[PDB]
Structures are given as structure tokens and as C-alpha cells.
Amino acid sequence: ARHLLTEQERATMMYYLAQYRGGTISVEAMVMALFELLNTHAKFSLLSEVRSIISPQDLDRFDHLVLR
Amino acid sequence: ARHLLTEQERATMMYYLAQYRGGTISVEAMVMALFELLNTHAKFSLLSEVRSIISPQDLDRFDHLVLR
Prior knowledge:
homodimer; mainly alpha; Whirlin (chains A, B); 3 helices
């Protein structure tokens, strides 16, 4: 599950690192793409893991804050 | 090394989750603190791991973009 999530994001990181090392994208473009990727990982871990210990009356507030 | 980094951040996450579940902090305050924590983890992984495959002429540009 999480390892399959990790593998998909590492394959995406590698796609951007390869474009960078191949000289098709700039270092700035590459760093911004990695940050976008890591931000999606952060939001997804909060929704799939941290959410489990949130009190039921706060579940709606938590989901909107995490996604927005 | 990385496991000692992981343990320190998990102890910080637990501090905020405990304050939340104890009712001392709001769900919003807790989510914003977790996001700050995860953002520092993202920036630190880019500087300690991704940096290793950056071309030497881009190392200065990479460090400033990651930190700023």
C-alpha cells in the first residue's frame, strides 16, 4: 500500500531528476516540481494516517484544512 | 541518522497530537503545526538527499531555492 505510493512518487521524482540531468528542464523548474510532489505526499499522509486519531466532530474541519 | 531524524519529528508530531486530543489546541492550530513540521522535513530531505545528484554549477541555486 504505502510502499506502492512511495514507488509511484519516487518514479515521478526520477522523471524530473532525469529531465534536469538531461538538461531539458532548469534547476528551478525541477525544485518547484519536487516541492509540488512532496506537498501532495504531505497532504495525502495527513488524510490517510493522521486522520485516524482525529475526533469525529473535527473530521469535516480537518479534511477541508488539509486539502485547502 | 535518518531514523533519528524521523524519531525527532514523530516526537514533535506526537506533542501536537497530544495537545489537540487533550483539548488545549484547536484542530486548525494542530493541522498548521503539522504542515510546518512536514515542510521542514521536505526541505531537509531535498538538502540532505536530492542535493547529491545536483550538478556542481547548480549547487548554489539549488540551496537558495530549497531554503527560500
